[PDB]
Design a protein around this ligand. Structure first.
Ligand SMILES: [Ca+2]
Length: 320
Protein backbone atom coordinates (compact mmCIF):
# COMPACT_ATOMS: atom_id res chain seq x y z
CA UNK A 1 0.00 0.00 0.00
CA UNK A 2 0.96 3.67 -0.33
CA UNK A 3 -0.49 7.18 -0.62
CA UNK A 4 -0.50 7.46 -4.42
CA UNK A 5 -4.30 7.49 -4.79
CA UNK A 6 -5.27 9.04 -1.43
CA UNK A 7 -7.75 11.72 -2.47
CA UNK A 8 -9.24 14.38 -0.22
CA UNK A 9 -12.73 13.04 -1.00
CA UNK A 10 -13.86 9.45 -1.60
CA UNK A 11 -14.09 8.18 -5.18
CA UNK A 12 -17.44 6.93 -6.50
CA UNK A 13 -17.28 4.67 -9.56
CA UNK A 14 -20.45 4.96 -11.67
CA UNK A 15 -21.10 2.21 -14.21
CA UNK A 16 -22.83 2.69 -17.54
CA UNK A 17 -25.16 0.68 -19.77
CA UNK A 18 -26.18 -2.89 -18.77
CA UNK A 19 -24.08 -2.39 -15.67
CA UNK A 20 -24.18 -3.05 -11.95
CA UNK A 21 -21.58 -3.08 -9.20
CA UNK A 22 -21.10 -6.84 -9.70
CA UNK A 23 -22.57 -8.86 -12.57
CA UNK A 24 -24.61 -11.72 -11.09
CA UNK A 25 -22.80 -10.88 -7.86
CA UNK A 26 -19.72 -12.52 -9.40
CA UNK A 27 -18.10 -10.22 -11.99
CA UNK A 28 -17.12 -6.68 -11.04
CA UNK A 29 -17.98 -4.00 -13.58
CA UNK A 30 -14.74 -2.17 -12.68
CA UNK A 31 -12.64 -5.30 -12.87
CA UNK A 32 -9.90 -5.16 -10.24
CA UNK A 33 -10.01 -1.37 -10.31
CA UNK A 34 -11.44 -0.82 -6.82
CA UNK A 35 -8.82 -3.14 -5.29
CA UNK A 36 -5.97 -1.34 -7.08
CA UNK A 37 -7.01 2.16 -5.97
CA UNK A 38 -7.50 1.04 -2.37
CA UNK A 39 -4.06 -0.58 -2.60
CA UNK A 40 -2.73 2.92 -3.39
CA UNK A 41 -4.61 4.80 -0.66
CA UNK A 42 -7.97 5.63 -2.26
CA UNK A 43 -11.36 5.32 -0.57
CA UNK A 44 -13.48 3.81 -3.35
CA UNK A 45 -17.21 3.07 -3.38
CA UNK A 46 -18.94 1.44 -6.36
CA UNK A 47 -22.49 2.48 -7.21
CA UNK A 48 -25.17 -0.06 -8.14
CA UNK A 49 -27.65 1.55 -10.54
CA UNK A 50 -30.21 0.40 -13.07
CA UNK A 51 -28.37 -1.12 -16.01
CA UNK A 52 -31.17 0.08 -18.31
CA UNK A 53 -32.83 3.44 -17.58
CA UNK A 54 -32.73 7.12 -18.36
CA UNK A 55 -30.64 9.37 -16.15
CA UNK A 56 -33.33 11.95 -15.37
CA UNK A 57 -36.75 11.08 -13.98
CA UNK A 58 -37.75 9.69 -10.58
CA UNK A 59 -36.88 6.11 -11.60
CA UNK A 60 -33.76 7.19 -13.50
CA UNK A 61 -30.16 6.40 -12.64
CA UNK A 62 -29.45 9.99 -11.57
CA UNK A 63 -31.70 9.95 -8.51
CA UNK A 64 -30.32 6.50 -7.71
CA UNK A 65 -26.77 7.89 -7.77
CA UNK A 66 -27.78 10.99 -5.80
CA UNK A 67 -29.18 8.71 -3.09
CA UNK A 68 -26.12 6.44 -3.23
CA UNK A 69 -23.72 9.38 -2.90
CA UNK A 70 -25.46 10.37 0.33
CA UNK A 71 -24.97 6.90 1.83
CA UNK A 72 -21.26 7.21 1.01
CA UNK A 73 -20.99 10.58 2.77
CA UNK A 74 -22.82 9.25 5.83
CA UNK A 75 -20.41 6.28 6.00
CA UNK A 76 -17.13 8.17 5.45
CA UNK A 77 -18.01 11.43 7.20
CA UNK A 78 -16.75 13.28 4.12
CA UNK A 79 -18.46 16.29 2.56
CA UNK A 80 -18.04 15.63 -1.18
CA UNK A 81 -17.23 12.80 -3.59
CA UNK A 82 -15.16 12.41 -6.75
CA UNK A 83 -17.55 11.00 -9.36
CA UNK A 84 -15.87 8.81 -11.99
CA UNK A 85 -18.41 7.58 -14.54
CA UNK A 86 -17.85 5.22 -17.46
CA UNK A 87 -20.13 5.22 -20.52
CA UNK A 88 -23.62 6.31 -19.37
CA UNK A 89 -22.15 6.68 -15.87
CA UNK A 90 -20.65 9.99 -16.95
CA UNK A 91 -24.12 11.18 -17.92
CA UNK A 92 -25.37 10.07 -14.50
CA UNK A 93 -22.47 11.91 -12.84
CA UNK A 94 -23.33 15.14 -14.67
CA UNK A 95 -26.88 14.86 -13.33
CA UNK A 96 -25.73 14.63 -9.70
CA UNK A 97 -23.29 17.51 -10.25
CA UNK A 98 -26.13 19.64 -11.65
CA UNK A 99 -28.82 18.91 -9.03
CA UNK A 100 -26.54 18.67 -5.96
CA UNK A 101 -23.36 20.60 -6.84
CA UNK A 102 -22.38 20.79 -3.15
CA UNK A 103 -21.90 17.01 -2.87
CA UNK A 104 -19.53 16.81 -5.86
CA UNK A 105 -15.89 17.89 -6.06
CA UNK A 106 -15.11 16.55 -9.55
CA UNK A 107 -16.65 14.75 -12.52
CA UNK A 108 -14.58 12.39 -14.69
CA UNK A 109 -16.14 10.62 -17.69
CA UNK A 110 -14.65 7.56 -19.41
CA UNK A 111 -16.04 6.89 -22.88
CA UNK A 112 -19.24 8.77 -22.02
CA UNK A 113 -21.77 9.47 -24.83
CA UNK A 114 -22.34 13.15 -24.06
CA UNK A 115 -23.73 13.60 -27.59
CA UNK A 116 -25.32 10.15 -27.86
CA UNK A 117 -24.38 7.00 -29.72
CA UNK A 118 -24.73 6.37 -33.45
CA UNK A 119 -25.25 2.71 -32.54
CA UNK A 120 -28.24 3.77 -30.43
CA UNK A 121 -29.67 5.52 -33.49
CA UNK A 122 -28.95 2.34 -35.47
CA UNK A 123 -30.69 0.07 -32.95
CA UNK A 124 -33.72 2.36 -32.72
CA UNK A 125 -33.92 2.50 -36.51
CA UNK A 126 -33.81 -1.30 -36.80
CA UNK A 127 -36.65 -1.69 -34.28
CA UNK A 128 -38.70 0.72 -36.40
CA UNK A 129 -38.79 -1.95 -39.13
CA UNK A 130 -41.65 -3.54 -37.15
CA UNK A 131 -44.39 -0.85 -37.11
CA UNK A 132 -46.48 -3.00 -34.74
CA UNK A 133 -44.00 -2.18 -31.97
CA UNK A 134 -44.18 -5.83 -30.88
CA UNK A 135 -40.56 -6.55 -31.81
CA UNK A 136 -39.44 -3.65 -29.62
CA UNK A 137 -41.78 -4.84 -26.87
CA UNK A 138 -40.58 -8.45 -26.78
CA UNK A 139 -36.92 -7.46 -27.17
CA UNK A 140 -37.22 -4.92 -24.35
CA UNK A 141 -38.71 -7.55 -22.03
CA UNK A 142 -35.80 -9.94 -22.63
CA UNK A 143 -33.28 -7.12 -22.22
CA UNK A 144 -34.97 -5.97 -19.00
CA UNK A 145 -34.90 -9.57 -17.75
CA UNK A 146 -31.18 -9.62 -18.54
CA UNK A 147 -30.72 -6.61 -16.27
CA UNK A 148 -32.76 -8.25 -13.51
CA UNK A 149 -30.70 -11.46 -13.53
CA UNK A 150 -27.28 -9.76 -13.77
CA UNK A 151 -27.96 -7.02 -11.20
CA UNK A 152 -26.22 -7.83 -7.92
CA UNK A 153 -29.47 -6.87 -6.15
CA UNK A 154 -31.89 -8.24 -8.79
CA UNK A 155 -32.86 -4.63 -9.55
CA UNK A 156 -36.21 -4.83 -11.34
CA UNK A 157 -36.19 -1.11 -12.24
CA UNK A 158 -35.01 -1.80 -15.79
CA UNK A 159 -36.29 0.22 -18.77
CA UNK A 160 -34.52 -0.92 -21.93
CA UNK A 161 -36.48 1.36 -24.28
CA UNK A 162 -35.87 4.42 -22.11
CA UNK A 163 -32.20 3.41 -21.93
CA UNK A 164 -32.04 3.03 -25.72
CA UNK A 165 -33.76 6.37 -26.37
CA UNK A 166 -31.55 8.10 -23.78
CA UNK A 167 -28.37 7.18 -25.67
CA UNK A 168 -29.60 8.30 -29.10
CA UNK A 169 -27.86 11.32 -30.59
CA UNK A 170 -31.12 13.30 -30.71
CA UNK A 171 -32.20 12.69 -27.11
CA UNK A 172 -28.70 13.26 -25.68
CA UNK A 173 -28.81 16.77 -27.14
CA UNK A 174 -32.08 17.30 -25.26
CA UNK A 175 -30.35 16.03 -22.12
CA UNK A 176 -27.65 18.65 -22.66
CA UNK A 177 -30.37 21.30 -22.89
CA UNK A 178 -31.92 20.17 -19.60
CA UNK A 179 -28.54 19.80 -17.85
CA UNK A 180 -26.03 22.12 -19.53
CA UNK A 181 -22.42 22.19 -18.39
CA UNK A 182 -19.48 24.48 -19.05
CA UNK A 183 -17.35 21.40 -19.74
CA UNK A 184 -19.29 20.79 -22.96
CA UNK A 185 -18.51 22.55 -26.21
CA UNK A 186 -21.17 23.85 -28.54
CA UNK A 187 -23.41 21.12 -30.03
CA UNK A 188 -21.83 19.81 -33.21
CA UNK A 189 -18.35 21.26 -32.69
CA UNK A 190 -16.39 18.12 -31.70
CA UNK A 191 -14.70 20.39 -29.17
CA UNK A 192 -14.61 20.24 -25.38
CA UNK A 193 -15.60 23.06 -23.04
CA UNK A 194 -13.89 24.41 -19.91
CA UNK A 195 -11.75 22.36 -17.50
CA UNK A 196 -13.75 23.55 -14.46
CA UNK A 197 -17.21 24.85 -13.61
CA UNK A 198 -18.70 26.86 -10.74
CA UNK A 199 -22.25 25.68 -10.01
CA UNK A 200 -24.19 26.75 -6.93
CA UNK A 201 -21.05 28.14 -5.30
CA UNK A 202 -19.03 24.94 -5.80
CA UNK A 203 -16.04 24.51 -8.11
CA UNK A 204 -16.13 21.19 -9.99
CA UNK A 205 -13.09 19.78 -11.77
CA UNK A 206 -14.18 18.26 -15.09
CA UNK A 207 -12.21 15.47 -16.78
CA UNK A 208 -12.67 13.00 -19.62
CA UNK A 209 -10.81 10.56 -21.82
CA UNK A 210 -11.89 8.26 -24.64
CA UNK A 211 -10.91 5.04 -26.37
CA UNK A 212 -10.51 5.19 -30.15
CA UNK A 213 -9.33 1.71 -31.10
CA UNK A 214 -11.84 1.43 -33.97
CA UNK A 215 -10.56 3.69 -36.76
CA UNK A 216 -12.12 4.47 -40.16
CA UNK A 217 -10.33 3.08 -43.18
CA UNK A 218 -9.57 3.92 -46.80
CA UNK A 219 -11.48 2.50 -49.76
CA UNK A 220 -11.53 2.89 -53.51
CA UNK A 221 -15.10 2.94 -54.88
CA UNK A 222 -15.98 5.16 -51.93
CA UNK A 223 -17.56 3.50 -48.88
CA UNK A 224 -15.76 3.49 -45.54
CA UNK A 225 -14.82 0.60 -43.27
CA UNK A 226 -13.03 0.07 -39.95
CA UNK A 227 -9.94 -1.42 -38.34
CA UNK A 228 -9.23 -2.41 -34.73
CA UNK A 229 -5.99 -0.68 -33.75
CA UNK A 230 -6.02 -2.24 -30.27
CA UNK A 231 -5.30 -5.75 -31.58
CA UNK A 232 -2.70 -7.59 -33.58
CA UNK A 233 -4.60 -8.13 -36.86
CA UNK A 234 -6.38 -11.46 -37.38
CA UNK A 235 -4.44 -13.35 -34.71
CA UNK A 236 -4.68 -11.28 -31.51
CA UNK A 237 -5.60 -13.67 -28.67
CA UNK A 238 -8.02 -11.09 -27.24
CA UNK A 239 -10.29 -11.91 -30.19
CA UNK A 240 -10.73 -15.38 -28.66
CA UNK A 241 -10.33 -14.62 -24.94
CA UNK A 242 -12.71 -11.62 -24.97
CA UNK A 243 -15.90 -11.96 -27.06
CA UNK A 244 -16.46 -8.19 -26.88
CA UNK A 245 -13.30 -7.49 -28.92
CA UNK A 246 -14.86 -8.55 -32.23
CA UNK A 247 -18.36 -7.57 -31.09
CA UNK A 248 -17.29 -3.96 -30.49
CA UNK A 249 -15.42 -3.94 -33.80
CA UNK A 250 -18.66 -4.76 -35.61
CA UNK A 251 -20.76 -2.22 -33.72
CA UNK A 252 -18.00 0.35 -34.24
CA UNK A 253 -17.99 -0.37 -37.97
CA UNK A 254 -21.75 0.28 -38.01
CA UNK A 255 -21.00 3.61 -36.32
CA UNK A 256 -18.28 4.50 -38.85
CA UNK A 257 -20.69 3.89 -41.73
CA UNK A 258 -23.20 6.25 -40.08
CA UNK A 259 -20.61 9.05 -39.92
CA UNK A 260 -19.40 8.69 -36.32
CA UNK A 261 -15.66 8.71 -36.95
CA UNK A 262 -13.21 6.97 -34.64
CA UNK A 263 -14.89 5.33 -31.64
CA UNK A 264 -14.56 2.58 -29.04
CA UNK A 265 -17.36 0.40 -30.48
CA UNK A 266 -20.23 2.37 -28.93
CA UNK A 267 -19.11 5.98 -28.24
CA UNK A 268 -17.36 8.22 -30.75
CA UNK A 269 -14.52 10.62 -29.99
CA UNK A 270 -16.63 13.76 -30.47
CA UNK A 271 -19.39 12.48 -28.18
CA UNK A 272 -16.84 11.67 -25.46
CA UNK A 273 -15.25 15.15 -25.19
CA UNK A 274 -15.90 16.74 -21.79
CA UNK A 275 -14.03 19.15 -19.53
CA UNK A 276 -10.28 18.61 -19.59
CA UNK A 277 -9.75 16.02 -22.33
CA UNK A 278 -6.72 14.13 -21.02
CA UNK A 279 -6.46 11.80 -24.03
CA UNK A 280 -8.46 10.43 -26.95
CA UNK A 281 -5.56 8.30 -28.23
CA UNK A 282 -6.11 5.18 -26.11
CA UNK A 283 -6.26 2.04 -28.27
CA UNK A 284 -9.31 0.86 -26.34
CA UNK A 285 -12.71 -0.50 -27.24
CA UNK A 286 -15.66 0.42 -25.03
CA UNK A 287 -14.99 -2.06 -22.21
CA UNK A 288 -11.21 -2.01 -22.49
CA UNK A 289 -11.73 1.23 -20.54
CA UNK A 290 -12.99 -0.75 -17.52
CA UNK A 291 -10.36 -3.54 -17.74
CA UNK A 292 -12.88 -5.95 -19.29
CA UNK A 293 -13.35 -8.67 -20.07
CA UNK A 294 -11.42 -10.02 -17.06
CA UNK A 295 -8.48 -7.78 -17.94
CA UNK A 296 -8.13 -9.11 -21.50
CA UNK A 297 -7.24 -6.41 -24.02
CA UNK A 298 -5.51 -6.23 -27.38
CA UNK A 299 -1.72 -6.28 -27.50
CA UNK A 300 -1.75 -2.59 -28.49
CA UNK A 301 -4.16 -1.48 -25.75
CA UNK A 302 -2.71 0.44 -22.82
CA UNK A 303 -3.22 -0.62 -19.21
CA UNK A 304 -6.54 0.92 -18.07
CA UNK A 305 -5.89 0.14 -14.40
CA UNK A 306 -2.74 2.28 -14.32
CA UNK A 307 -4.53 5.05 -16.24
CA UNK A 308 -7.29 5.16 -13.63
CA UNK A 309 -4.64 4.91 -10.90
CA UNK A 310 -2.79 7.91 -12.36
CA UNK A 311 -5.98 9.99 -12.45
CA UNK A 312 -6.65 9.26 -8.78
CA UNK A 313 -3.19 10.71 -8.15
CA UNK A 314 -4.13 13.59 -10.46
CA UNK A 315 -7.22 14.20 -8.33
CA UNK A 316 -4.99 14.00 -5.24
CA UNK A 317 -2.64 16.64 -6.66
CA UNK A 318 -5.52 18.88 -7.78
CA UNK A 319 -6.65 19.15 -4.15
CA UNK A 320 -9.71 16.87 -4.13
CA1 LIG B 1 -11.13 -6.18 -23.80
Amino acid sequence: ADDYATTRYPIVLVHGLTGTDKYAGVLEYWYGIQEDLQQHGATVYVANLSGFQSDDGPNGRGEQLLAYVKTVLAATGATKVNLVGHSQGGLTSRYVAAVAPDLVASVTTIGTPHRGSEFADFVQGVLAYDPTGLSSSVIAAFVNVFGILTSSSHNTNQDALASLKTLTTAQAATYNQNYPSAGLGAPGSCQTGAPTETVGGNTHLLYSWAGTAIQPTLSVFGVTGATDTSTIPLVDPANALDPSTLALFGTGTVMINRGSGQNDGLVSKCSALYGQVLSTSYKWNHIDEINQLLGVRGAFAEDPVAVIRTHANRLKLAGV
